Amino acid sequence: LTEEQIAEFKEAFSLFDKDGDGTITTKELGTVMRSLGQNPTEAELQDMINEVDADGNGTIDFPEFLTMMARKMKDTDSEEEIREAFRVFDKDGNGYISAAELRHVMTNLGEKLTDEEVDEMIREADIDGDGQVNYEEFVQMMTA
Ligand SMILES: [Ca+2]
């Protein structure tokens, strides 16, 4: 249902294209951000456009917005999947996965590990050496 898909993307684009000329400029991007409680500098506004402007003409057109929007979507889907799985491991939602927590989910996965085996797993991902795995350390282990 691309047709319906493009429609939703067109809708998003129009929010930024304040004057409707078919392009988004630094100033238009600027008014959108400011309405969000963010007052970026012209320098920051230029870096944002630079990242998305494939033909280097200085503005973003629909096709350029579409391709970036897409790639961004895919990525937002990744993050929320990993964040979901983090919540399942962090049985007490304290923000960190302990040895005991990791060992209990592992048994549920069909792997009966000893405390020493779980401790080794934690150690491998434990960057701040606090004996637990935080989200940052979890994504590192996940992705990498
Ligand atoms: Ca415009």
Ligand SMILES: [Ca+2]
């Ligand atoms: Ca462009």
Ligand SMILES: [Ca+2]
């Ligand atoms: Ca926890």
Ligand SMILES: [Ca+2]
């Ligand atoms: Ca840690």
